Each structure stands twice: as C-alpha cells, then as structure tokens.
Symmetry: D6
Subunit: 135 residues, 12 copies
C-alpha cells in the first residue's frame, strides 16, 4: 500500500463518519449522536452566540424540541470537503454545508454554513471532540 492510497483511505474514513454524524442530526437520533461525539465535545456555533459550549448539554435541546419532531424534508449537500490527517488517531474536516429545507410559511429555502469538525480515534472508534460552525 502506497502512502498516497493509504492517505486517501483515511481521508474517506473521516468523510464517511462526518456524513453519518450529519444523518444522525437530520433524523434526530440522539443516541447515534452521543455514540459519535466525545462526551467532552466543545462547540462554537451561531446558536451559542459567540460562546464556547459543552456541545452534549447544549445540543440536547434541539433534539428534544425540533430534530426528532420534524418530518419536513431537508436535503444536505456537502461541498468541497478538505481533510487533514494529523497522525494515526487524529483528523480534521472542513466543509461547506448547503441545506435545502421548507420554511414555516411553506416556501423552500437554502442555507449555507461553513463547518469544522475535529476527530479523535479512541478505542477503535472515531469521536468528534470539537465543532466550529459559522453562517
């Protein structure tokens, strides 16, 4: 195995798990969510109003009160992802997320956000330890 092919595989490994995380969010599967996220997950994101939050407590609200409750359609597009492999057990993904969705008044709309996720493999499982979202 060349290190080029090796690097491609690892990079794909991080894309797949990032995509699964996003699926768990969209479906409102908090058990899947907690399984993929490190319990010490920290987050910068618009809803946290410029503060760094412990993501596991702060995100419970969106699952209890929105994401599981919805059956309205939403299509997520991940654009131009870039993965930094930082040794055997650490990685980092930066990507643009376009989300098509339907608004309360019925119309369909799009939103863009720019997202960073930092990944740590512990005991054979990749876990998200940090998340930065802007939009």
């Amino acid at each position: 195995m060349t290190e080029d092919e090796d690097l491609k595989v690892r990079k794909q490994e991080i894309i797949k798990i990032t995509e699964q995380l996003i699926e768990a969010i969209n479906n409102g599967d908090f058990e899947a969510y907690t399984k993929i996220c490190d319990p010490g997950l920290t987050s910068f994101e618009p809803e946290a109003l410029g503060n760094l939050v412990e993501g596991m407590d702060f995100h419970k609200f969106y699952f209890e009160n929105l994401l599981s409750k919805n059956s309205k359609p939403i299509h997520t597009t991940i654009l131009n992802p870039h993965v930094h492999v930082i040794g055997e057990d650490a990685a980092c993904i930066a990507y643009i997320r376009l989300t098509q969705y339907i608004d309360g008044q019925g119309r369909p709309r799009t939103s863009q956000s720019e997202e960073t996720r930092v990944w740590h493999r512990r005991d054979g499982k990749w876990l998200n330890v940090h998340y930065h979202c802007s939009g």
Copy 2:
C-alpha cells in the same frame, strides 16, 4: 509525572504557540508566520466570504498591505481558551479573541471573534494546519 500534570503541560504548550502566532500576526511578521503555519494551512474566516482558502496565499495580502504597515496600538485578549490534546502529535485550541484597537476616525473600539486552530507537530515543531474564525 502524573498524566494530569503531563496533560496540563501539553495544553500550555499549545497556548504558548497560539499566542506566539497571534503576536506574529499583530507585528506583521510574515516570516514568523510562515514558520508556525503548515504550508497546507486551510482557513474559514470572514474575509474569505464563506469559502475555504489556502491560508498562506490568502494571508499574504494582509501582511503586505496592512499588518506590517501599522504602528497603531492594538491589545489582544484571549478569553476562556480550551485545548483538546488528541494524541502525542495533534492538538486543537478554541478561544475567544477580543481586540481593542483605534479606528480610522480616531475612536477606540473592540471586536470579538471566535477562533479554532488545529495543530500538528512535525519534526519537533508545532504547525497550524487549520483555522476557523467567526465574527
């Protein structure tokens, strides 16, 4: 050495280098900047308008045309930093940056931004591989 004290030291290691990076930016020292940044540095930041940029090319403009040129005072404050140690050679810092500065019309002002920097130690030197800034 307990792993608690060990972890504290590594965490401090990342704070010091993040602070030095910020000093190099404020002074407009691009040579210091390039020494601390990985050549493959990627960045999400307000000036990149929602796109991911190769940070070394995109940042040259701010050094050539602003940061070295200035002697106007600026005080940076780093608030509530949080460091994730992700194995021997990988780390990640999230912090709030308050910058006090003087505006073109003379008045002093403050700006807040929320910042993530991902770090990789290669050949004994810590290098910044990703940067996410919102504000």
Copy 3:
C-alpha cells in the same frame, strides 16, 4: 446557405432551451433529466454563490414545489442570443421574465438573466452548465 445554416442551428438551441423551461414549469423531472447532462453544474441564487451539481440540487425543487403547484405562471424569454461553437457545442444567453401569483393574492414579475451551455452527444442536445443571476 451558410447564413441559413447558422439560423437553423440557432433556432435548434432556442427550441430545446424552451422545452427545458416547459419541463421545469410543469415539474417534469424525467423530461428534465433527459435534457440535462448528468454532470450539469450550476451557478444560481438558491446555491448561495456556490457551484453545485445541478441534478442532485434541483431534485428538491421538483419534489417539493414545481410538481405540487396548480398556480399560473407565464414565462417570457427576452432578447435571446445564441453562440454556435462548432457542430456539437452552443451557448444561449437570455432574459427570463416570470409572471406569477404570490402568497397574499397578488401577481408579480421576476427577472433573471440566464446562460445555458449545450453539448450534443449521440444526436441529443444536453445542458452541461447553467448560470442564473437575479
């Protein structure tokens, strides 16, 4: 016969652009996918300054809007211009006025400026790129 040749090809590109727009208005995704290249790229307002692979991105508007709509709309194509770029390539630029009826009862117009790039593969014209501003 050289000039008349050019006229014909130009009209060929207008007809197919017009059919594409009919497919969109009727919410016919099968017609749409038959006229669009599977690798279609798009710049457009709903993509928020990004270039998208148009076939995945457009599915949403067919599933959730264009097919479930009984409301009248009249499209007007203004001042089209066609560049014939060899036997198998062309390019159309036009203004699109759309008359429609809005939420609060009333009728409105929107203008957009549109570029479509065309490629003939195995005798069928296919849209490979689309740029929309408005």
Copy 4:
C-alpha cells in the same frame, strides 16, 4: 487513462487562458484583452444592470477610466474552477473569484463573484465568446 490525461491537459489549457484574461483585466491591458476576447463577446454582469451587452464596447469604459489608472494592490483568488470540454474547439469554465483590494476609506476588503466564461478556439487561438458574472 491517456484518454484521461488528454482531458486533464485541455482543462488546464482553459484555466491558463482564463487566468491570463484576468491578469489582462487587472493590469488594464486592453490590447491583451481584445486579443483574448471574441469581437462578438456578449456579457451578463452586475454593471450591465440585468441586460446582455456586447462586452467589447461596454468594457472600454472600465479600461479608459479605472483599470489602467490604478497602482492600488489587488489579489485575485480563483476557487474551485470546473471546466467542461465540449469537443475539440469548445470549452466552458465556471469559477468563484475572490478579490482582495483596498477601499476609499483606506481599509482592505474582499469581494466574491461567480463567473462563467465560454471559450471557442478559432485559428488555433482560444477566444472568450460569452461571460456571465454574478455578485454584490
């Protein structure tokens, strides 16, 4: 593979020429501009206010009164270009353009625009026949 390498080369051909066109615009070289553009160039762009213009007449103004005038720095970045090769003599490039520049108030700013250029090779030279720009 060689089918593939061929395609890669053509695609790079169109990127190089697009980049050269942009250099000509930034430097205010109208002679270089007119050499790279088809005389029948059409344009959709923000300054044309929703109209399609014949780009060679409409663009003269910006060369005469702006682009040739300026020694103010500007860095252009081309992000995520995509090229469609549409046969031996036709191609098409879509890209995002970020422009770093300096404003009247003194300060540096960024602008994004999304750009389509359509290309036609006539007598061995690639010429831009259509241009669609959106932004601001």
Copy 5:
C-alpha cells in the same frame, strides 16, 4: 368648412375618447375589447415589465386571466391634465396622469399615480394603440 382650430380640437377629443375606452376595457377585464383597440404589435414599457420592452398582447394576457376579469372590487380612475399631439391625419399621441382610487388587501382605500403615454395609429378607419409607456412606483 370648420376652423383649423376646431378641427384640431375634434381630433384631440377623438384620441381622448378612445384612450378612455381602452381604460374602461382594462378596468372591466374585457380582453376582447382590449385586443380590438390594441395593435397586435403593441410594445410596452411598464413597471411590471421590470425595465424591459415587452410585446404587450402576450404580456398583458396574464393580468386579464388572473386579476382584472375576476375583480368585484371598486376602483375609480381619474385622468389628469391630458395632452394630445396630433401627428398627421392618421397618427396621434396622448400623455396623461392616471390616479386610481382602489381598495387594498388589509381593507383600506388607497390611491396610486402613474404617468402614461399612448401612441395611436389609425388603420382602416380604426384607432389602434401601438406603444405604451407607463411610469409609477
């Protein structure tokens, strides 16, 4: 015969009458009346055309199909300070201000002003509107 002046008065009145009839047909949503008074090649500049020149017969269909016909709501049109240029035996041109009193969605009554030019061509004894320019809002 008649005074050159009284002749001119007559013609001018002719163009006012026909312009007024056109406006009635529009208000009543009478498309057949409308098409009878408009040249099939009518061109139009108007707010709803967003700065473009449109072939008025296709572009106006939409407002008859979806608004003007189907309306029960009262509207009073006032034509202010019309001016007619008689441009030979078979050509004329009218410029006028149109105030429209009407009732709005939230119930209330409102006024709108628009400034309007209509160019007229008599073909086979019948005056037809060939161009229309409307500005307002």
Copy 6:
C-alpha cells in the same frame, strides 16, 4: 414586397439616426442643436419632473445651463434593443433602453438604466421630437 420591406428598414434607420443625434446633443450640452431637433411644443414625462408633464424646452434649459455644457467628465451611452413604429409618412415612434456609464462624485464609475420613448413628427422635411417619456430609478 422586396421594395417595401426595404423602404420600412430605411425609415426605421432614419429615426434611429436622429434619436442618436439628439442624444449626442444632450451629452455635449449643445442646446442650439437640441432646440433644432425638438419641437417647441415638446412635452416630457421624466424622473426630474416628479410625475408631472412639463413643457420640455423650458424645463430642460436648466440642465444645459448648469450641467451638460460645464461637463468635462466621460460618459458612454449604450442604446439597447431599439424598436421603431413607423406611423405613416410623417410620424414615427422609438422605444429604447439607455445604459449610461459615467463617473461619480466619490470618483468611482457607475451605470444607470433608463427606458425611453420618443415620438417624432416630420414638419417641412425635418424630424422633430414632440414627446418624450423617460422612466428609471
């Protein structure tokens, strides 16, 4: 016929040429040229008249005395998609879009669009503008 279509083409071009000359006269601030091409009874709807119909010769004097003649700053006018209605031997009508590139107060170059109607009347062998309707921001 072959001869007739060609005749119509020529008259249409006649009206474009004179409209273009009128625009040159305005750009250059040549009021004498302007008054020679305009009917003394010219009426105008235009943004600077604020919804009113004005007698154009008096109203336009101000812009010639205080702006158009004084001006050394560059301006490029583009006429888009003109359409001419020939309304008999002595009457015509042109509708066009005018893009004007120009340089502003803070130094920068800008564009403005306006949609324009001019009505024409040939008197004693000379085409004269009798009405003008201009709409734009």
Copy 7:
C-alpha cells in the same frame, strides 16, 4: 370702530360654524350634506391626491361610497387654533389644525394631525367651500 369689531367676530364665528358642520358631514358620511356645503367646482390639494389638484366632488365620492358611510367606529375630531380671514362681504378663509382620535386595525386608538385650509364663498345667501388644502 367698536361695532365693526363685533361685526367681524360674528362673521368669523359664521365661518367656524359652517366649517364644523362640513366636518360633521364628512365624519357621518353624509354626501348630500357634503355636496350642499361644497361648491361643485371645489378644488382640493390633499395627501390622497398625491401632489395633484383634483376636482374634489368626483374624487371624494370614493371615500363616501367605500368608507365614511359604512363606518360605526368612533372618532373624535378636535379643531385647534382656528384662524379666519374675512375677505369682504362674500368671501372668507379658514386655517386650522385637525386632530383626529380614532381606532385602528390592530384595535388600538391613535391620533393623526393635519393642517387644513378652506376657502369660502357666499353665493345666494349660502356659504360654499371652493377650495381645500390639507397637509399631514
């Protein structure tokens, strides 16, 4: 003189009473009363006429047909600081501020101010409003 000052007072009062009666007719939606008090040639400058001078009798019909009549919502009109110019035996002129308290769509009560001029002409022993200028 003393009995010319009292004479002037009376005439001024005459013009206030008739102006007040006109306003009552408007508030009640009584168009017959309105047309009896207004000259058929009444001209009007007012906010609903959009900067134009209108023949008031045709233009006001709309507000009687479609609003002032079918109203039963309360409204209190206050006339502040009236001033009357007596311009000979048969002509006068009143300038006044009108405050109107009323109830809005949201159910809330509101006030509006307008400044009003009415010009009066006595023809055949009856005072008639010939002109009206309202701003607000």
Copy 8:
C-alpha cells in the same frame, strides 16, 4: 354672458401675474417687495413651520436674512396647472404646483415639488396675500 367670461379671464390672469411676482421676490430675496405684496397679518401653513400656523411676516424674515438674499446659485421655478377661484370683486384664491430646479450641496442639480395655495385680498387697489398653505 360673453363679456363676463372675458372679464373672468382677466381677473384670473391678474391673480397669476401677482402670484408670479411674489415668487420672483422670494427667489431674489427682496423682502421689501415681499412685504409690499403680503398682508401684515399673513398666516402660513408650511413644512418649515412643523404643522403649526405661523404669522408669515416674522417667520419668513429668517429665510431672507440668512438664505434667499446671499444666494447667487441658479434656480428655475415652474408653476404647473394653476387654478384660480374668483370670489367676488376683492377676493381670489390660487392653487398651483411648484417645481423648483436647483443645485445642491454635492454640486448636483435636483428638483422639488410643492403644492401651494395663496389667498388674495384687494385692499385700496392693491392685491395682498393673506394666507399661504404649502405642502411637500
């Protein structure tokens, strides 16, 4: 009757000429001319009086002292669609639109529209403005 229609025309013209002369006096900043044409008891509703009725002669002094005089910047006034009501031998009333072309602070030329009412009273053979209502 025929010679009452011509009589009416003349009087109406009389009122336009004097209104035009008043405006000339205002544009030139001639306060002496102004006070000769206005009744000392002139009242005024106008935008600069902020919804209040002012005694026009004291309130207008400020604009003559501080503006209309020391002006040499060009201004072209157009009076559109005047309408005159003759209210007996000694009273009249004019309603008109005033377009004013002028040059602004930035150096640019601009237009303003205002709708104006002037009420006139002839005392001792001279027409005097007793009331003024301006909106815009």
Copy 9:
C-alpha cells in the same frame, strides 16, 4: 424648624396621594373620578396630542369611552423618584417617572416609561389638576 419641616413633608405627601388616586382613576377607567380630580380647564401636553396643547377634559374622553373602561388586561404602574414643589398654601407641582408594565397584542408583557409633570391647585378645599405634561416614546 422641627414643626415646619414636618409640615412640608405632610403637604408633599398630600400631593403624592392625590396624584396616585388620579392614576388609579385612569387605570380603572373611572371618568367621574377623573373629572372630580381634574380642573375643567385642564391643559395637556402629551404624546397622543402630537406636539399640541389640548384641553384635557374633551381630549381624554376618547380614551375612557374606547379603551380604559373596556380593559380587563392587567397593568402595574410604578412611580419612580417623585419630586414635589410646594408653591404656597394652595399650589403644588409633582414631577415623576412612570413605568407601566402591561401585556401586548401578540400576548407578551412589556414596559413603557414616561416622564410626567402635574400642576395642582387647591380650590374650595379640593386639590385639582390644572396642567399635565407627559413625555415618552
């Protein structure tokens, strides 16, 4: 003196009590109570009078007929930092800030501040409000 300071304190409290009662009457929509505490010549500057001085008894009738009496919705008034000027045996003056907590149209609770002056005149043993100045958003 000891007795004098105490005298002044009592009169000041007299003026606060009656101001508070006036405010109760307004909140409850009791117009008879209101008219008993107000001088019939009461003048008022207040936001709803739009910069004008009004005769308060006529102007305030509207708010009693159409709002204050109809109202079942809760409101808490807070009077902050009152200041009383005793201006002789029969005249006084109170300035205070009024915070009003209340519930709005979209259901939510809100606060409004206003700054208020009331001038008082004792006639025949009864304090009456003769002037009122209210300022606030």
Copy 10:
C-alpha cells in the same frame, strides 16, 4: 378697583414677560441672568436628560460653558399659543410651543419644535422658575 378679569390678564402677562426674558438669557448664553431667574432647586425633565429628572442648575451649566455663550450663529425663537394658569397670588404655570429657527452644521437653516412647561414661584417679590418640562424630537 380693576376688573377681576383685567387683573387676571395682567398676571398672565407678567408670567409671559418673565418666561420670554428667561428664553432671551438662554439664547444669549447669560448664565448670571439665568441663575437670577431660576430657583436654585429647579428640577427639569428634558430631552438631553434622557428620561431622568435633573437638578437643572448643575445640568445646564454645561450648555452655557460649551455652547450658548460661545455662539455667533443667528436663531429666531417663536412662542406659539402660550397658556398661563394663575394658581394664587404667588404661583403660576405656563405651557407653550417653541419653534426655533437656526442654522445647521452643513450650512442650511432648520426649524425645531418643542413643547414646554415652566412652573413659577414668586419669592420676595421676584418670580423664579422651579420646574421645567420640555418635550421634542
């Protein structure tokens, strides 16, 4: 003696005169005149106090030191529709609208309206302003 009515007229005029003198002292930036006419315990509600009641003598010093004194620029004050309440031999109260014509920074002349209440107390033969309420803008 004098008519109860003529007596009342006199007193009312007394309060207008003194209010006018206060306004002149303010316009001229005469602080010594100002302090002579104002009670040392003067309280004020006014726009510059941002909804607070201030002790007017300390708060107004700033405008005399830094503005009203040092001004050469013309200003015409108009007092409209004053109303005076005579509240016994030694107490009064005036409500009036103040229109101020003035010249602005960018050169131009402007008007401002404010609605004003002044409460007056005669002590030792001299009328002194004890309270001031100003609303506007």
Copy 11:
C-alpha cells in the same frame, strides 16, 4: 490549600444558590423566589428601561402573567461563572446566561444576558440584595 479548599466550598455555595434562584424563576415559583431574595432587592435590568427598581414589586408582574403560565420548554446554561467571596457573610457572582427557548412563530432561539448577583447571608440564609442584568 485548606485556605484554598475553604474558598472553593464558599464559591460553590454561591453557585448552588444562584442556580436555585434561576430554577425558581423558570418554574414561576414566587414563594421560592421571595425566600431567596432580600425584600430590599434592587435591580438594573432591560425591562426596567435604565431605571433601578425595587425588584420584589417589579418582578411580581412576570410571575403573575408569564413564568407561572408556561409549559413551553426552556434550557438555561450558565457560562464561565466567577465568584468573589467578600468576607464571611457577603459574596458576589458574575455569569453569562444562555437561554434556549421556543418563540411565537414556532421556532427555537437563544438569548444571552450578562448577570451580576450580590449576596448577603442573614441568619444563616443567603439572600440576593442586588441584581444587574444586561442583554438584548
């Protein structure tokens, strides 16, 4: 060290009680609220419009008409608290409060406020004597 552990304990004491106060407010328990607050509590807060209020009277309204009324979910997060121990019987806490909640339009939203509470222990019970809230 034990000097230090002592300080840590007191600081936690003040966090627990502050958190309990916030629970009482969210649940709309006024009885619990009045037990934790000094009767002389003063407050600076957005709803008091720049004024200092006696918090016990002013806060009654929100309990009567809002907080006790609601079964709509809300999650409060206290970020980066800082406690000053100011002697045996006085303390002071500064913290950021993020509140996740659901709005009228249906949607969930966040609000930040910065909060200071000053504490006084009287007869063995900690009481809030002052409160300063900034935000929105």
Copy 12:
C-alpha cells in the same frame, strides 16, 4: 446611632465611587489601580458580553483616550443606592449621565446604569466587580 452609623458607611461608599469616577475622567491610571482590586472583573459594553479582568482591559482606554483628552465632560450621578453588606463589604448601584462634546462639534448626553461591588482590605476600599449597561 445605629441609623446614623449606616448613613456614614453609605456616604463612605459614595465618596470612593465618586473618586473612582474622577480618576477615570482625568485619566489617572495610578489612582485607578490604587482604588481597584487587582482581580477586578467587569461586564461592560466595550467587552461585548464577556466578563473581562478589568485591569488589563482598561489599560487601553487610559493609554489611548482618557489621558490624551482636553475636551470637557460633566458626570452626573443619579439616584444612587448603597447596600451595606457587613463591616467590610458594600455595593453601589447608580445612573450615570455624561455630558460631553462629540466629533462634529455638538454636545451630547449618554446614560449608563452602573453597579460597583466594594471590599475593604487592610483599611482601604477596593472595587472588586463592575457591571455597566448602556
């Protein structure tokens, strides 16, 4: 003597708060640091919703504004209220009106609401916390 005691301590806190404000207005940082606890924390508008260690954060305003300023300013303290929290602790809440002169010539007012918490250590009152809204 119990009530009079309370009055005195309350006035003690007003005087020192007033001195603090004088130090700020004059740009006297040495006076400022002598009256402020080195661990002073602050909530204030220029901190953008964050809690800052006031001694580092305030240095900038002294270095670049408060000392280099000859322009007049009048501070008014309205309706102060002092809570005495034992022998060594107190707390003051007040409204601060500041009259000042602005860039384009003119004079203006600003209001802010201010809390300062005080701790007496070794006989000297020190500000430990500061909350400013406006």
